[PDB]
Short mmCIF file of C-alpha atoms and ligand atoms in Angstrom, two decimals:
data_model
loop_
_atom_site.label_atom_id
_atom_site.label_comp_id
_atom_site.label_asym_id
_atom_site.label_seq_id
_atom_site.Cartn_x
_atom_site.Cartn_y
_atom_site.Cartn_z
CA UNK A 1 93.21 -21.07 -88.83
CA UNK A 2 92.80 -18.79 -92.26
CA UNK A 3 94.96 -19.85 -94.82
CA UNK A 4 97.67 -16.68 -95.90
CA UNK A 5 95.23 -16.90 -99.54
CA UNK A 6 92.36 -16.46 -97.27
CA UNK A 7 93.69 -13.66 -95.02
CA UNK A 8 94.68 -11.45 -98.30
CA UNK A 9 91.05 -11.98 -100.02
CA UNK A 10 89.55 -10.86 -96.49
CA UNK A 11 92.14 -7.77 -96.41
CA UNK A 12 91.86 -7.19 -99.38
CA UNK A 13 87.80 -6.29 -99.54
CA UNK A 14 88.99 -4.58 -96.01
CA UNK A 15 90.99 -1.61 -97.40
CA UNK A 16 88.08 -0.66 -99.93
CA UNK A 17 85.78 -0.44 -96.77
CA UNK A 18 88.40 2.18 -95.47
CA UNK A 19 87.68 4.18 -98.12
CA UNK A 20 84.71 4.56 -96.40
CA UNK A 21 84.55 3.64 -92.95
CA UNK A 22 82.04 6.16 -91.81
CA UNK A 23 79.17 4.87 -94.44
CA UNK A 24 79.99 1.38 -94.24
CA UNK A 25 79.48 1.26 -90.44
CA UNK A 26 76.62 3.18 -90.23
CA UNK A 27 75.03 0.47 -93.31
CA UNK A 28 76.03 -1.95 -91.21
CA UNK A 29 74.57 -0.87 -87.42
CA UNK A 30 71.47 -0.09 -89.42
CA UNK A 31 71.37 -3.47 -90.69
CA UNK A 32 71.89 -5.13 -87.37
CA UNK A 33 69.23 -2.93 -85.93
CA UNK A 34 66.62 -3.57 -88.55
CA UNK A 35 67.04 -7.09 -88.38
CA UNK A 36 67.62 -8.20 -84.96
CA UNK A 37 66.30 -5.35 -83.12
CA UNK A 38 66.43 -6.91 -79.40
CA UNK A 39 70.37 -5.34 -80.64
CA UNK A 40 69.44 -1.56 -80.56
CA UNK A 41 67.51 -2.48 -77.02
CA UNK A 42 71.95 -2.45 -75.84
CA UNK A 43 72.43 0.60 -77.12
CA UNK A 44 70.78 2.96 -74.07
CA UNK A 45 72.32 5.74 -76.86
CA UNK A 46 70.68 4.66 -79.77
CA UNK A 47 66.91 3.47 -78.56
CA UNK A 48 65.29 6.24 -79.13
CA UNK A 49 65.80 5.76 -82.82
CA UNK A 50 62.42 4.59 -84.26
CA UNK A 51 62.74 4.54 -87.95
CA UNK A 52 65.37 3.70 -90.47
CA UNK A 53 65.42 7.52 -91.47
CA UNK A 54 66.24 8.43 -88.10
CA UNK A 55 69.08 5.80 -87.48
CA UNK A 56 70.44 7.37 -91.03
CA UNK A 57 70.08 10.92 -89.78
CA UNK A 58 72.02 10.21 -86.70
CA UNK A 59 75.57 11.88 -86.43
CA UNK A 60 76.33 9.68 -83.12
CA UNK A 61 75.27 6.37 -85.07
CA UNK A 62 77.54 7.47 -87.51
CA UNK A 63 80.62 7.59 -85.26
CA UNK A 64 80.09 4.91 -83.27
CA UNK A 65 80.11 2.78 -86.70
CA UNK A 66 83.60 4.29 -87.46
CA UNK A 67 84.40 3.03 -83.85
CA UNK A 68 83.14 -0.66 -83.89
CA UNK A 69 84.52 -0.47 -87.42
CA UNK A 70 88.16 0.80 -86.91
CA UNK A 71 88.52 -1.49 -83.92
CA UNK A 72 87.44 -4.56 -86.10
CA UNK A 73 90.09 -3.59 -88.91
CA UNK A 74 93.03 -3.21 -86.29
CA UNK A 75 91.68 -6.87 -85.45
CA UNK A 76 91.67 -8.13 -89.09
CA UNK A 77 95.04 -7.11 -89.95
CA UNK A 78 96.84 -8.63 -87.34
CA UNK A 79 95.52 -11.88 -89.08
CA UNK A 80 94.88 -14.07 -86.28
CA UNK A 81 97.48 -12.75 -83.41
CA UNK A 82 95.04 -10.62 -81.74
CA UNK A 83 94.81 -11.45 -78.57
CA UNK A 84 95.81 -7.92 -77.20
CA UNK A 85 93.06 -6.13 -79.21
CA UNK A 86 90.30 -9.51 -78.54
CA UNK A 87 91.04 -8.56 -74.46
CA UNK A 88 89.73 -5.58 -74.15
CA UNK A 89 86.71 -5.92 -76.01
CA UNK A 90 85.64 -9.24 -74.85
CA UNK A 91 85.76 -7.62 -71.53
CA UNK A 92 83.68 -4.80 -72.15
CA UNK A 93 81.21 -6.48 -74.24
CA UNK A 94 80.80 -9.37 -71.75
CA UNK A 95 81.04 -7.97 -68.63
CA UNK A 96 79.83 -4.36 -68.63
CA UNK A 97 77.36 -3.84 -72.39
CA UNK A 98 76.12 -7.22 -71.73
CA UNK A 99 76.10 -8.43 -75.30
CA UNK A 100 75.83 -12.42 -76.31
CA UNK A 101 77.79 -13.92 -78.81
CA UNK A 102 74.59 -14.53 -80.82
CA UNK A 103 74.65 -10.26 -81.32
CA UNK A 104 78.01 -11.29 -82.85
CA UNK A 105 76.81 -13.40 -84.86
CA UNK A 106 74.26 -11.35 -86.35
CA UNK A 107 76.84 -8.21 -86.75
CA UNK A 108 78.72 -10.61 -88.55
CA UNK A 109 76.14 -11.04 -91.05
CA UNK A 110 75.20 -7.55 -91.74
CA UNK A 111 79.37 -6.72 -91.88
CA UNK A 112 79.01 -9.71 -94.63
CA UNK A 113 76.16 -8.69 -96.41
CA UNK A 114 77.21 -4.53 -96.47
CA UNK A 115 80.32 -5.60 -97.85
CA UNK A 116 78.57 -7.83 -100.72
CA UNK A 117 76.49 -4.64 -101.89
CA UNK A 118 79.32 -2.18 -101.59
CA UNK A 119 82.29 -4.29 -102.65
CA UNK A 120 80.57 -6.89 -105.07
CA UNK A 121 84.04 -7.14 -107.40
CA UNK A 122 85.96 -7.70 -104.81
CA UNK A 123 83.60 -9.91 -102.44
CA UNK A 124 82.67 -12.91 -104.39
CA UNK A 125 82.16 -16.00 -102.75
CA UNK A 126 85.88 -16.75 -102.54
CA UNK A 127 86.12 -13.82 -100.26
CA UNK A 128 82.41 -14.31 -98.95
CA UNK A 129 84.04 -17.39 -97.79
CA UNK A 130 87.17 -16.65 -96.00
CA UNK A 131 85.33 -13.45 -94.48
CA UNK A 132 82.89 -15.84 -92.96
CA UNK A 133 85.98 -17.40 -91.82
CA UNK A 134 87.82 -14.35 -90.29
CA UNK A 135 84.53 -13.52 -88.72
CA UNK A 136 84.15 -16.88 -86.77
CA UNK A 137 87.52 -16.79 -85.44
CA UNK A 138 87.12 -13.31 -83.97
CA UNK A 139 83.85 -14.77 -82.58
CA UNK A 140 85.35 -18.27 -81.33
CA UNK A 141 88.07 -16.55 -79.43
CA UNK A 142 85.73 -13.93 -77.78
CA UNK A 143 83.44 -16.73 -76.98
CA UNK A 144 87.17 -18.42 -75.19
CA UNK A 145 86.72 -15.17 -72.90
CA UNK A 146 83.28 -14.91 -72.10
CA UNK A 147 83.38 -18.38 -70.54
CA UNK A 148 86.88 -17.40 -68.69
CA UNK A 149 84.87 -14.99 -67.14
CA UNK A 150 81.20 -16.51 -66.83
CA UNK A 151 79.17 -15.24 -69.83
CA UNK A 152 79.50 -17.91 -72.49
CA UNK A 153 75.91 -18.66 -71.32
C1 HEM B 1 82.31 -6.43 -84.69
C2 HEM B 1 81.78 -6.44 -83.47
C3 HEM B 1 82.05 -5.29 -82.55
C4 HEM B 1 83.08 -4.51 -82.33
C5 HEM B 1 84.45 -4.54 -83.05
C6 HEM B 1 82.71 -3.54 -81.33
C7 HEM B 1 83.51 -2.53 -80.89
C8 HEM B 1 83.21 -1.63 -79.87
C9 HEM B 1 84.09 -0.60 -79.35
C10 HEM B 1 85.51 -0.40 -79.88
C11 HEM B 1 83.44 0.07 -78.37
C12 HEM B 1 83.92 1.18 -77.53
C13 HEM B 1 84.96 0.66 -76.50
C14 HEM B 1 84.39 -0.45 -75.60
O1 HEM B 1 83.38 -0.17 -74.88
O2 HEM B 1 84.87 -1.61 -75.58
C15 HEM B 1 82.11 -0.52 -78.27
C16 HEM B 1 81.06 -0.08 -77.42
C17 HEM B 1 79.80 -0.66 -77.32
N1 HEM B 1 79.33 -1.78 -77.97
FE1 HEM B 1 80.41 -2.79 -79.45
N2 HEM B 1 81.42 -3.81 -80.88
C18 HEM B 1 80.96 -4.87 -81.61
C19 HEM B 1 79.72 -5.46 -81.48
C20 HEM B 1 78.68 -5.00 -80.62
C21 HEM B 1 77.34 -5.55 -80.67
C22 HEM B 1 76.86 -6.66 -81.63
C23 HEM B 1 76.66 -4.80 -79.70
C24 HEM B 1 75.17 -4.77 -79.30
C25 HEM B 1 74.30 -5.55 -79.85
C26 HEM B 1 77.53 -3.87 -79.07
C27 HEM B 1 77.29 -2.98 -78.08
C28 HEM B 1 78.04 -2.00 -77.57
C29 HEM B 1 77.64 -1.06 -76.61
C30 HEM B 1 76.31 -1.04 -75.96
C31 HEM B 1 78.77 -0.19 -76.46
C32 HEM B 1 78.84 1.08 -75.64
C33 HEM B 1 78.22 2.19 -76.58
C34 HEM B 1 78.06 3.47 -75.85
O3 HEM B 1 77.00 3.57 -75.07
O4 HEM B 1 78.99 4.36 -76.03
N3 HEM B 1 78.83 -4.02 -79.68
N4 HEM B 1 81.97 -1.57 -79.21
#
């Protein structure tokens, strides 16, 4: 359970990202991609992207960061009592793009690390922290409904 002090560091950093949605998920799907690429193999959209030049040239990447992203803010700023926003999600990820909670884990740490070179001010380790925090609660409660339904693994 995040502290209140912990939830307003974590929003906090959020609303500077929504300044900015569009090139803060596209940093951050180009991240995952580069370093855990087994993660772009999902993405029967994306695959043909080769080379870091091509993910950044691509106007679909670019929306379906704003996507991933705008779905993980409505998440954030209900602080905990997401359930209704965790359902839908856990269901599609699990059960029709396939996706372990390891790939959540490593988006988690390219959200983490895009925010520390965009939002350094405002994403010391204070925030680092209870971001890390936020992060493994939205993972721990997906995980809850993978195994309901036979994908916890
Ligand atoms: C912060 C974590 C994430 C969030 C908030 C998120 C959010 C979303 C949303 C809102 C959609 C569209 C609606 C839906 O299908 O449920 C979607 C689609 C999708 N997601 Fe995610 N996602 C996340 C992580 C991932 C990861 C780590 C992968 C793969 C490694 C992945 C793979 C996919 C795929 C394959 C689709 C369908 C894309 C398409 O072909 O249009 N997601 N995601």
């Amino acid at each position: 359970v995040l502290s209140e002090g912990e939830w307003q560091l974590v929003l906090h950093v959020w609303a500077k990202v929504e300044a900015d949605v569009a090139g803060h998920g596209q940093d951050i799907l180009i991240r995952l991609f580069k370093s855990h690429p087994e993660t772009l193999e999902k993405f029967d959209r994306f695959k043909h992207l080769k080379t870091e030049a091509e993910m950044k040239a691509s106007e679909d990447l670019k929306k379906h960061g704003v996507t991933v992203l705008t779905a993980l803010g409505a998440i954030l700023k209900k602080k905990g009592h997401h359930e209704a926003e965790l359902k839908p999600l856990a269901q599609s990820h699990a059960t029709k793009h396939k996706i372990p909670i390891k790939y959540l884990e490593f988006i988690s740490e390219a959200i983490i690390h895009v925010l520390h070179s965009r939002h350094p001010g405002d994403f010391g380790a204070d925030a680092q922290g209870a971001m890390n925090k936020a992060l493994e609660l939205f993972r721990k409660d997906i995980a809850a409904k993978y195994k309901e339904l036979g994908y916890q693994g």
